[PDB]
Chains A and B, each alone.
Chain A
């Protein structure tokens, strides 16, 4: 799974 550093959701608005 691609893990996200930083607090912003990749699929966010």
Chain B
């Protein structure tokens, strides 16, 4: 799936850079372009992608400091300059557009829905939001920003693929290492999903999986491959289970309307019975009547299952997240 990335805010520009960097290093070429939009000048200066600074007449290049409503207003006023960065960038070859944002911030939170709603109303391709959910320890302000933002993008975007920061943690890590590690894991997951269509899993399988709308999740897990395909039947079953149950970008995302199961690895090592049974298992676990599947042939000593879940519902993490956010607002209104 050939795509155009637009980061909004600091986290968004960082994740958008990591994804483009993954696509470039591997040579997949799925990312046709990447642009970062922000209101903090310093954030933009460090990024290796095209950058657009907006809002200087309001906040003088120093960000909106977690003010969601200021983040939205600036994107409203300055969207033409944003859209115009995309003129020569959203080419004809684009099969989708990802608006990448941290939902808890001010700029991404405010600007992402605005830009998503603007793009969705003109381009023929799907507009997706790759949205970062704040960790549960983050301040009430960030929970509230994300709550409102998530609600808005879930209506305006064609789908919202969610990344839970709390899902990607390593003991002992520094603050910046943590963020980079999250971005890098997301980049590999999303990049492979985008690359599968470029060869074999048609890009249309991704589109039809996300077509239902609302929240999506992306699962990943891998295992060493034996050269003999028959030895890898268990490996395919278990990576697929892990991808759906533990390795998902949003925790507890099993209950989904649609799914796409991609088994990646060397063709000779991928067993027929493993793949068939793994897909059937996903269908039983999700309850979905729209489980699609395909294989991604690539050089590796391993096998992996990459499972996209579209129309995710009844996720404990999402429900917990919305619950605390509403409690912050209730407490704030007094």
- Docked pose: A5 CA to B26 CA in angstroms: 8
Q: Are A10 and B26 in contact (CB under 8 A)?
A: yes
Chain B 3-28, CB within 8 Å of chain A: the 1/0 string? 00000000000000000000000111
A3 to chain B minimum Cβ distance, whole angstroms, is 5
Interface secondary structure of B, over-half rule:
mixed
Q: Is B173 an interface residue (CB 8 A)?
A: no
Range of interface residues on A (Cβ < 8 Å): 10 to 19
B264 within 8 A of A: yes
Categorize the interface residue count of chain B.
10 to 19
Task: Tell me the B91-126 residues at the A interface (CB within 8 Å).
Answer: none
Taking a contact as CB atoms under 8 Å apart, the answer to whether A4 and B299 are in contact is yes
What A residues does B287 contact at CB under 8 A? none
Chain B, residue nearest A6 (CB): B25
B267 (CB) vs chain A CBs: closest residue: A1
Tell me which of B265, B297, B299 has the highest count of chain A C-beta atoms within 10 A of its own C-beta. Answer: B299
Residue of B26, B264, B266 contacting most chain A CB atoms (<10 Å): B26
- Smallest Cβ distance from B170 to chain A, in angstroms? 12
Once the chains are docked, how many angstroms separate the CA of A10 from the CA of B265?
A: 9
Contact between A11 and B267, CB atoms less than 8 A apart: no
Distance A2 CA – B304 CA, assembled complex (angstroms)? 15
Asked whether B297 lies within 8 Å of A11 as measured between CB atoms, the reply is no
Q: Which residues of A contact B (CB under 8 A)?
A: 1-5, 9-13
Chain B residues near A (Cβ < 8 Å): 26-28, 192, 195, 199, 222, 264-267, 297-304
**A-B CB proximity, top 9 nearest:** A11-B302, A2-B298, A4-B299, A1-B297, A11-B304, A11-B222, A11-B300, A3-B299, A9-B300
